[PDB]
């Protein structure tokens, strides 16, 4: 029971309960925000919502309301900043903000989702720098990885590399897929049993729990970089070839 729906803001036309068949492989949903998932039903299809303060403060996710939203919605887990390593946030800045605003939530917490960049001061390098800046004063349960690349072998080596750099830590993968042009179905088919087998991986969320039509209209940048082959829904709102693996 490690799988989750990476559920975008534009997903009002779709029903998260489509990818929940009661077998209990799919357990979680997050929407990059602290507001409840926008859905066709207005519910989360029996999945546990994970609030996310994905920027330091926004109109959609006001950090002044993070603690009140958490208490009001009953989250068991919270995610923090989305890809600060490429969004202009220094490790020291992230550590200070995380201690002020995320530390106080007395639930399960993940450090910010970092990219798979190999550039010094991005990706896992940035993450190490933030753990240094934290100076033992950050409270967290999880490190949170994104990965986009061209093969299962590369993905497997990256997760192994993160584990070798952070051997004590538990990992959440809040976004992952191949870049455009690969065989997304074969990748996820290999990745799900690999991740299900790792004791130090708690949750994974394929990019992305939407349809090709919604991804094209609302996130043309993701279509450029990933394509529409990892969408868990068809335009008809049913499970795609990738969605079918989630069950
Ligand atoms: O109508 C659905 C929902 O819309 C919310 O406002 C949204 C923002 O949440 C959205 O924010 C995007 C992030 O979720 C994503 O990670 O990054 C992108 C790109 O930077 C953001 O745009 O932006 C849209 C587009 O303007 C807004 O309409 C409301 O806050 C919410 O109450 C409402 O249910
Ligand atoms: O994220 C690690 C653990 O955080 C816990 O809450 C912390 C409190 O126990 C501690 O006393 O204070 C800090 C600062 O507010 C809290 O973050 C959670 O209760 C645990 O579930 C979590 O594993
Ligand atoms: Cl990563």
Q: Taking the domains of the chain in order of start, what are their residue ranges?
A: 1-247
Which phi and psi (to 5°) does residue 40 adopt? -55, -35
Q: How far is the CA of 153 from the centre of ligand 1 (A)?
A: 34
Q: Which letter does DSSP use for residue 82 in this model? A: B
Q: Give kind and range of the element (H or E) at residue 178.
A: strand 170-178
Question: How far is Cα 175 from Cα 208, in angstroms, rounded to an integer?
Answer: 8
| Residue 18 burial (CB count, 10 A) | 19
The end-to-end CA distance of the chain, in Å, is 10
- Of 60, 207, 219, the residue with max ligand 1 atoms within 8 A of its CB, to mutate for a pocket test, comes to 60
**Helices 184-197 and 152-165: crossing angle, nearest 10°?**
30
Residue bearing the CA closest to ligand 2, atom 8: 106
| Cα–Cα nearest to 105, from 78, 81, 72 | 78
Distance, CA of 236 to CA of 247 (rounded, Å): 18
From the CA of 58, the nearest ligand is 1
The full length of the chain comes to: 247
Reduced to 3 states, what is the DSSP secondary structure of residue 65?
A: helix
The alpha carbon of 174 is separated from its chain's Cα centroid by a whole number of angstroms, namely 2
**How far apart (Å, rounded) are the C-alpha atoms in residues 136 and 154?**
32
CB atoms within 10 A of CB 85: 27
Residue 207's nearest CA partner among 172, 158, 173 is: 173
- 169 close to ligand 1 (CB < 6 Angstrom): no
Tokens of 10: 């534009």
- Ligand 2 is surrounded, with C-beta below 6 A, by 103-104, 106-109, 139-141
Q: Is the dihedral of CA 197, 198, 203, 208 positive or negative?
A: negative
CB burial of residue 214 (10 Å; 0-12, 13-18, 19+): buried
**Cα(86) to centroid of ligand 3, in Å?**
12
Handedness of CA 64, 73, 95, 222 (dihedral sign): negative
Dihedral sign, Cα of residue 235, residue 239, residue 245, residue 246 = positive
Alpha-carbon distance values, 100 to 32, 57, 69, 223 (Å): 20, 12, 16, 36
* Nearest Cα to Cα of residue 77 among 21, 44, 30, 25: 30
Query: How many Cβ atoms from other residues are within 10 Å of residue 41's Cβ?
Result: 11
Phi, psi of 228 (to 5 degrees): -110, 5
CA distances from 21 to 18, 49, 193, 245 (A): 7, 17, 19, 12
Quickly tell me which residue has 């999945």 as its tokens: 47
Residue ranges of E strands in 179-239: 201-204
* Residues 180 and 224 sit within 8 Å (Cβ to Cβ): yes
* Alpha-carbon gap, residue 216 to 208, rounded angstroms: 12
Question: Whole-angstrom Cα distance, residue 175 to residue 232?
Answer: 13
Handedness of CA 163, 161, 84, 79 (dihedral sign): negative
Q: How far is the CA of 23 from the centre of ligand 1 (A)?
A: 31
Tokens of 65: 């309301």
């Amino acid at each position: 029971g490690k799988r989750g729906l990476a559920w975008p803001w534009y997903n009002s036309p779709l029903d998260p309960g489509v990818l929940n068949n009661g077998d209990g492989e799919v357990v979680a949903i997050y929407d990059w925000e602290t507001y409840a998932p926008p859905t066709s039903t207005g519910g989360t299809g029996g999945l546990g919502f994970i609030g996310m303060q994905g920027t330091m403060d926004s109109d959609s996710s006001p950090v002044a309301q993070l603690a009140t939203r958490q208490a009001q919605q009953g989250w068991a887990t919270v995610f923090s900043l989305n890809e600060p390593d490429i969004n202009g946030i220094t490790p020291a800045e992230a550590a200070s903000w995380y201690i002020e605003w995320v530390n106080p939530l007395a639930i399960k917490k993940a450090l910010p989702a970092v990219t798979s960049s190999t550039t010094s001061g991005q990706g896992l390098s940035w993450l190490s720098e933030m753990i240094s800046a934290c100076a033992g004063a950050c409270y967290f349960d999880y490190i949170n990885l994104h990965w986009y690349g061209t093969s299962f072998a590369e993905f497997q080596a990256y997760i192994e590399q993160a584990h070798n750099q952070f051997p004590s830590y538990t990992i959440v993968i809040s976004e992952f897929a191949l870049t455009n042009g690969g065989n997304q179905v074969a990748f996820f088919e290999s990745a799900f049993p690999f991740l299900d087998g790792l004791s130090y991986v708690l949750l994974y969320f394929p990019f992305v729990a939407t349809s090709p039509a919604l991804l094209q209209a609302n996130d043309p940048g993701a279509v450029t970089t990933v394509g529409t082959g990892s969408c868990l829904y068809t335009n008809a709102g049913g499970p795609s070839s990738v969605g079918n693996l989630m069950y």
